[PDB]
Amino acid sequence: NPNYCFAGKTSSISDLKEVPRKNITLIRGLGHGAFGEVYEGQVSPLQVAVKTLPEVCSEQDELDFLMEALIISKFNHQNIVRCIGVSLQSLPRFILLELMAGGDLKSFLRETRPRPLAMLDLLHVARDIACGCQYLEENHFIHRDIAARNCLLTCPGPGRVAKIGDFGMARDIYRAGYYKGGCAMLPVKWMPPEAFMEGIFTSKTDTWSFGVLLWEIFSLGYMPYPSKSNQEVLEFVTSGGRMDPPKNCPGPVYRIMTQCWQHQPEDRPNFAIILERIEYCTQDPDVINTALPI
Numbered sequence: 001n002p003n004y005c006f007a008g009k010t011s012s013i014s015d016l017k018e019v020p021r022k023n024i025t026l027i028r029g030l031g032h033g034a035f036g037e038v039y040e041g042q043v044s045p046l047q048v049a050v051k052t053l054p055e056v057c058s059e060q061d062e063l064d065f066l067m068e069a070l071i072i073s074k075f076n077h078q079n080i081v082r083c084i085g086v087s088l089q090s091l092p093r094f095i096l097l098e099l100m101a102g103g104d105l106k107s108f109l110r111e112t113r114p115r116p117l118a119m120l121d122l123l124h125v126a127r128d129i130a131c132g133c134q135y136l137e138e139n140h141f142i143h144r145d146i147a148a149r150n151c152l153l154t155c156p157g158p159g160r161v162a163k164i165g166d167f168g169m170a171r172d173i174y175r176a177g178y179y180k181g182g183c184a185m186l187p188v189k190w191m192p193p194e195a196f197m198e199g200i201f202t203s204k205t206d207t208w209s210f211g212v213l214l215w216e217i218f219s220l221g222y223m224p225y226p227s228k229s230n231q232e233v234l235e236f237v238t239s240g241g242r243m244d245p246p247k248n249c250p251g252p253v254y255r256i257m258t259q260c261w262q263h264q265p266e267d268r269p270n271f272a273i274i275l276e277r278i279e280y281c282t283q284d285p286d287v288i289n290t291a292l293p294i
């Protein structure tokens with residue numbers, strides 16, 4: 001049993017809630033995660049997302065899968081997907097998570113784009129993720145991969161809550177201390193200069209990635225640094241280059257992004273300050289009355 005440490009408490013495979021396999025039913029495929037397929041399922045009924053581990057995998061993949069279950073089960077915050085439990089004693093092995101019926105944020109933004117959503121919907125998504133990030137920061141947990149593709153929504157309609165739903169990068173660094181991948185797989189477009197240059201990671205790394213997420217949100221799901229490759233982005237950012245505001249982006253929202261992207265980590269705001277700034281934008285009629293492009 002590899003041990004896992006969070007908020008000064010240690011846990012192991014034994015502390016995970018094993019759900020009897022007979023109580024688990026798969027309904028439909030949702031796509032693929034890092035290891036294998038993710039399904040919509042039911043427990044005992046509880047609506048779940050079922051992360052599966054391919055039966056044809058290395059011993060390292062199994063340990064990576066166990067660590068993912070330990071990481072998610074130990075968080076306790078409304079803006080981080082809950083873990084119902086696991087099914088590790090039957091094959092293929094499962095991790096059971098809170099089903100997010102609105103899907104991922106990137107696909108939600110592209111699909112729900114006003115066509116022939118308002119500024120407040122976008123600000124609420126941002127605040128929700130900032131709350132989850134503040135919980136990680138206060139608990140000294142560095143996410144390393146804050147991005148729209150890693151955020152999920154409880155439902156498509158009004159009342160939706162955005163949550164952080166992937167901890168793959170953090171898990172990779174926890175086990176090995178380094179990154180499974182290589183340069184071509186690193187989320188370059190979400191990383192600050194000290195991270196891709198020195199391999200230095202702090203909660204100020206997450207501040208920078210949150211700035212990029214804010215751009216993804218207010219652009220309604222565009223890929224960051226339009227038309228630029230990873231190496232072009234690396235050179236651009238290291239030289240002081242920053243993205244322009246997304247189309248119709250209110251000035252106070254764009255200023256939060258530019259504050260998240262300060263070159264020096266000490267000049268970036270922490271998540272408590274980011275939250276205060278998003279809260280002020282939601283209060284500003286000139287911000288929330290700005291029409292989103294159609």
Ligand SMILES: Cc1cc(Nc2nc(Nc3ccccc3S(=O)(=O)C(C)C)c3c[nH]nc3n2)c(OC(C)C)cc1C1CCN(C)CC1
Binds near residue numbers: 034101152
């Ligand atoms: C992407 C996604 C997610 C969920 N719901 C969910 N998904 C988790 N994960 C996950 C899922 C797929 C791939 C990778 C991961 S992942 O875990 O590797 C990471 C990339 C998020 C969930 C984990 N916990 N809860 C989840 N809910 C969803 O729920 C249905 C019931 C709405 C629908 C969709 C798609 C959206 C676009 N169209 C329509 C096709 C369906």
